[PDB]
Amino acid sequence: LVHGGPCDKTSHPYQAALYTSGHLLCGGVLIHPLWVLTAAHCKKPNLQVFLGKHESSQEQSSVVRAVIHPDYDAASHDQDIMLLRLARPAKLSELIQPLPLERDCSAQTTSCHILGWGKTADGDFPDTIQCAYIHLVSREECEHAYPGQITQNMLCAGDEKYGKDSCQGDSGGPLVCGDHLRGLVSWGNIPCGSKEKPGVYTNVCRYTNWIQKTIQA
Ligand SMILES: CC[C@H](NC(=O)[C@H]1CN(c2ccc(C(=N)N)nc2)C(=O)O1)c1cccc2ccccc12
């Protein structure tokens, strides 16, 4: 993410890092000892999930099953969500904790934050997790930002002052509002930066029932 700074070691216990063949690929959110949520465009073979990373608190697991939303549309990023079934149950340890979903699509909090190990503004990739406060942007204003591209399955969020924004390598990471999972990093402007066009996030509240069915099955 661009224009933020390093999170506190204790302020991000739900954050996952997703690797493929030894390369950082995406972020992700622990939402249940056995399940990580991320973006559907993060589907790759040979996935490795690292939890409790920012190391002693860290833990690593293979993926047993990667369930892409049935209706994911790659060209438009509509329905950009994936569930990952961990081989090894997560060891909850205060540096590793699930995050509750936002279940109400009309929740009023518009002050949020984002997190990831994706690209910083200098085009580099950081060893330490980055954080930024941003705000939700109204659907109408986001539709104007990107005509023909914002569905009910997405939410927009950004920062008019400094342009704080997610970026490549942040995909699947959490948009957190009122300490609930509101969104997943999905797509946005390139070069990354939100002073003109907001970041676009998968609208997590619309997937409560699909998440519930997949886990509980
Ligand atoms: C799964 C591959 C990975 N895909 C992405 O990161 C997606 C997310 N995204 C993007 C763009 C802008 C914003 C925003 N402005 N809010 N948010 C997300 C893209 O443009 O592509 C990837 C793409 C390109 C370089 C990478 C380098 C290292 C690791 C992963 C990389």
Author numbering: 16 to 36, 38 to 67, 69 to 71, 77 to 125, 127 to 130, 132 to 147, 150 to 205, 210 to 222, ...
Question: What text comes from the article?
Answer:
We were pleased to find that DKFZ-917 and DKFZ-918 behaved as expected in a KLK6 enzymatic inhibition assay with pIC50 values of 8.51 (8.49–8.52 95% confidence interval) and 8.22 (8.18–8.25 95% confidence interval), respectively (see ESI†). To better understand how DKFZ-917 and DKFZ-918 inhibit KLK6, we solved crystal structures of them bound to human KLK6.25 We found that it was critical to first co-crystallize KLK6 with the peptidic inhibitor DKFZ-878 (see ESI†), before soaking with DKFZ-917 or DKFZ-918. The largest apparent difference is the lack of a water molecule bridging the oxazolidinone carbonyl carbon to Q192. Instead, the oxazolidinone appears to make a strong hydrogen bond to water #66, which resides on the opposite face. The terminal carbon of the ethyl group shows weak electron density, potentially indicating some flexibility of this side chain. No polar interactions were observable for the pyridyl nitrogen, making its position within the binding pocket ambiguous; it has been modeled as depicted in Fig. 3 on the “inner” side of the binding pocket. Furthermore, we solved crystal structures of both inhibitors bound to KLK6, revealing their binding mode.
The kallikrein-related proteases are a family of secreted serine proteases, a number of which have been implicated in viral replication. KLK6, associated with neurological diseases like MS, Alzheimer's,5 and Parkinson's,6 and with the migration and invasion, and thereby metastasis, of tumor cells, has also recently been linked to the zoster (chickenpox) virus. Infected keratinocytes were found to overexpress KLK6 and MDM2, and their overexpression was directly linked to viral propagation. We recently reported the synthesis and biological characterization of highly potent benzamidine KLK6 inhibitors DKFZ-917 (1) and DKFZ-918 (2), with pIC50 values of 8.6 and 8.3, respectively, and good selectivity over related serine proteases.12 In order to perform more advanced preclinical experiments with these substances, and to be able to make them freely available to other researchers, we required larger quantities than were originally prepared in the hit-to-lead optimization process.
